[PDB]
């Protein structure tokens, strides 16, 4: 528990996309609700409402969904991405977000999201802080 945020970024524009078919339809909301609480307890500030409603769509709609989210939310500071159930799409997703559309994303495996492990969300929260412009350290 020695990893801390020196400076917690402030996120005003964020939302969540899920390419997972397997998970309960309430998990994206629940998972993001706790993750943000974990980001916030560690020093970040988050607007509690996403900038556009959460989206759930099939893995074959990756190109479409990402570009849709990007055009409807040009100011997005963060996209929380729930990855497809089968691995192999992560490179495509990062490429589209990071290189092609210019969107800061955090990708999360649906099987791990399902666990709602609080140490996993601690790890993700610190990853999100740096991606969003914050600073982390180890005490």
Curated annotation (Swiss-Prot):
Q: Its domain of life?
A: Eukaryota
Give the protein's function. Involved in RNA-mediated post-transcriptional gene silencing (PTGS). Main component of the RNA-induced silencing complex (RISC) that binds to a short guide RNA such as a microRNA (miRNA) or small interfering RNA (siRNA). RISC uses the mature miRNA or siRNA as a guide for slicer-directed cleavage of homologous mRNAs to repress gene expression. Associates with siRNAs of various sizes, from 21-24 nucleotide in length and preferentially recruits small RNAs with a 5' terminal cytosine. Probably involved in antiviral RNA silencing. Associates with siRNAs derived from cucumber mosaic virus (CMV).
Tell me its family. Answer: Belongs to the argonaute family. Ago subfamily.
What protein name is recorded for this chain? Protein argonaute 5
Source organism of the structure: Arabidopsis thaliana
Shown part of the complete sequence: 562 to 699 of 997
């Amino acid at each position: 528990s020695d990893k801390k945020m020196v400076n917690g970024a402030k996120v005003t524009s964020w939302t969540c996309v899920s390419f997972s078919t397997r998970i309960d339809r309430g998990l994206p909301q629940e998972f993001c609700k706790q993750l943000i609480g974990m980001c916030v307890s560690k020093g970040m500030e988050f607007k509690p409402q996403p900038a556009i409603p959460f989206i759930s769509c099939p893995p074959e709609h990756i190109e479409e969904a990402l570009l849709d989210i990007h055009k409807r939310a040009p100011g997005l500071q963060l996209l929380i991405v729930i990855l497809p159930d089968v691995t192999g799409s992560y490179g495509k997703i990062k490429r589209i977000c990071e290189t092609e559309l210019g969107i800061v994303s955090q990708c999360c495996q649906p099987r791990q999201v399902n666990k709602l492990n609080k140490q996993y969300m601690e790890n993700v929260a610190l990853k999100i802080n740096v991606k969003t412009g914050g600073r982390n350290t180890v005490l």
